[PDB]
Design a protein around this ligand. Sequence first.
Ligand SMILES: [Ca+2]
Ligand SMILES: [Zn+2]
Ligand SMILES: [Zn+2]
Lengths: 9, 380
Amino acid sequence: SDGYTPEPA
Amino acid sequence: DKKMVEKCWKLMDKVVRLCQNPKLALKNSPPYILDLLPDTYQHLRTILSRYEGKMETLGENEYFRVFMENLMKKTKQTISLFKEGKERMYEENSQPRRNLTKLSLIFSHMLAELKGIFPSGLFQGDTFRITKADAAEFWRKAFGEKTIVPWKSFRQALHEVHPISSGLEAMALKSTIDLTCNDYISVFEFDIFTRLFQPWSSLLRNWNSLAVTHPGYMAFLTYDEVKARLQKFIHKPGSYIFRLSCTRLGQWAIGYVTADGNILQTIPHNKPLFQALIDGFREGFYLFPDGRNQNPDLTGLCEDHIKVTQEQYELYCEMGSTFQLCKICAENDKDVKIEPCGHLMCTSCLTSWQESEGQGCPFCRCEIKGTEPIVVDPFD
Ligand SMILES: [Ca+2]
Ligand SMILES: [Zn+2]
Ligand SMILES: [Zn+2]
């Protein structure tokens, strides 16, 4: 929401 | 010059007060100007510590000197931004505010560069290690141990390896690599640009097709502006965009809509941008750069030509890749205002104008009746 997520599947 | 650092403190302090205003409403999210400035000040004190006694090395150090010059200019510019924009500053979506955001990005980039050159307060620029062996050879070949080189020196050095088509491509490019916005290129900025647009082999082609020609590309954009801009496309999943990462300088940051209807953003750690963007189109995620229906084909960056029009480079620049530049040359700062019409430009284009093409304004043709000197265009 406010952070960096891992690259999608 | 401690007087230099002193003078700069006063200015930065003035910006902090302006930015602390309740009416302003800054969110702590990187880039956060209220951390950036005291952090910069504190690194500069560190450096000043290390050179107590040996302060002449510092006085001779070209980079530090150039850095201070630009630190002052940018804070002075931020101060006047507040003055000229006034009540505009408090409107979240205003162009004067947008300009505040851009300055936050620049302050972020500047600090990154400062620490990278004086880590722990010790000048290790003449010993700087570029990431890509390809690019690293290029720099030491053209500039040896230099930490910075004038843009033009840089542009002509680069030109002999990667052909730069025109003065517009060169200005579209400078806008992209010159993160500290000061017409120098440092070994550090070099480093980031060559990382962002790897591989070196097809450097400018990658940049052309990834930055310039690609409408998913957002120049001078932040995490929160991304999440903000993908709002109208919350309802059109596969909508995506990307920009430089701010916290991990040298990396990319793709923001995208999901079928779930939420907005995530991710940073591909190693893998190269077009591949990341290729697989990403493929696997059904990044489908509509900036919401548009057509997604560019990028295969072959992996290996035919096609060309960017001057129109397109003019768009890239016009669309915020440049900061406070004359729209005419896209090279010099906007430092002058024409009255009565009010159009702004650099004095270099105005002078060339009044003397070769005549008394009318370049944008609108109305008679130049007077001139005000300016320091910032909140509406750039
Ligand atoms: Ca620069
Ligand atoms: Zn100009
Ligand atoms: Zn005009």
